[PDB]
Chains A and B, each alone.
Chain A
């Protein structure tokens, strides 16, 4: 009865140039569920909703990565994780997490909309860039993050409804 949906979208930059497309891992109760990219999604299996939504997110995260004023040295990855859980007692947890080169550097709890900033000032720099970007460029508000939680939960429901 406790369930979780976990999206994991990765975008890459090479020598500071953000690559085309993206790669998304979706996990349903920790079981690998979809692997999506620019082209299509892969588990009458139609994933037009997923392809649309993940593509849009891919586009957003590429903007976000482009806004990181880090270095144009080698490969870098920006990876956003979105999790939502439906607990046994019907309560929810939900969160948003950014990894830069596999290091968790920023999280938001989507139940409370509180961010946890990392310890190292480097990681904090990354966090502040991204937070700037999200608030200023993307113009993201509380509503957006409420909606993000809801989207995730709606999808988790939807998937549970079918199988």
Chain B
């Protein structure tokens, strides 16, 4: 496709006409809403599983724009918008009138004054044109700091996952920068990336020949094999290449 993801704030995640940012600074809900408002935005509104399927891979619990009305007994978004069904599973965790988002489109009821991390979201249209455009990416790919990503939840072995990324004129995840790919901290589970062990040399290298940069990943031996699953907090778990797993493509460097 090769389309520029539309007006977003600088170094926000831009996905399907929606800007996003994850704040790992734990504030309470109110503080978190104000924090998003101070960036001309608001807390995460979840309106569609399809347009916001990026949210399926998120680690941990994050304040979401959803609020409970004591009188109604209904859940509404910060701006008053109704919570559409077949989006969220509301779970009674704590007594409270706010909800933490967590993956598999779940929503844990939490006390609003409990510090938690948070997600701001704003639509591309409501950001003015004098603003940051995320670099050329395919249509339905997650654009973050000009790199393009997509997560394939249909699990395949390493080789097929490579070919899968090849078929979309991409390659498997190549980590080259903790700063530029700090998004990867919030990925849950593990996923095939393009890091391959050469058993002869005993080395690790990327799909395109590049050698693994030091102090970029922690490598843990899990399953003997010549392929590495990315896992969160920049880890690279060694896995048998024939083991089917989910995977992450990226437009190449």
Contacts and interface: CB of A to CB of B under 8 A. Distances in A.
A18 interface: yes
A63 to B, nearest CB: 7
B60 A17 contact: no
Contact of B231 (A16, A19, A63): A63
B93 A17 contact: no
Contacts of B92: 150, 153-154
A96 B83 CA distance: 33
Contacts of A122: none
B232 A139 contact: yes
Interface in B90-125: 91-94, 100, 102, 104, 108, 110, 114, 116
Contact of A143 (B91, B116, B190, B222): B116
B220 A66 contact: yes
A29 interface: no
Contacts, number: 62
B123 to A, nearest CB: 28
Interface in A107-163: 137, 139, 141, 143-144, 146-147, 149-151, 153-154
B81 interface: no
Interface in B31-80: 59-61
Interface residues of B, number: 30
A67 interface: yes
Nearest to B24: A139
A151 B232 CA distance: 22
Given A139-B232, A147-B91, A149-B93, A66 B116 contact: no
B232 to A, nearest CB: 7
Contacts of A150: 91-93, 108
Given A19-B223, A20-B243, A53-B104, A139 B233 contact: yes
A93 interface: no
Given A137-B233, A143-B116, A67 B93 contact: no
Contact of B190 (A52, A63, A154): A63
Interface residues of A, number: 25
B169 interface: no
A59 B189 contact: yes
A143 B100 contact: yes
Nearest to A65: B222
Interface in B219-253: 220-224, 231-233, 235, 237, 240, 243
A143 B220 contact: no
Interface of B: 59-61, 89, 91-94, 100, 102, 104, 108, 110, 114, 116, 188-190, 220-224, 231-233, 235, 237, 240, 243
Given A18-B223, A150-B91, 17 more contacts: A17-B223, A19-B223, A20-B223, A20-B243, A52-B104, A53-B104, A63-B231, A66-B221, A66-B222, A66-B223, A67-B220, A137-B233, A141-B60, A143-B110, A147-B91, A147-B100, A151-B91
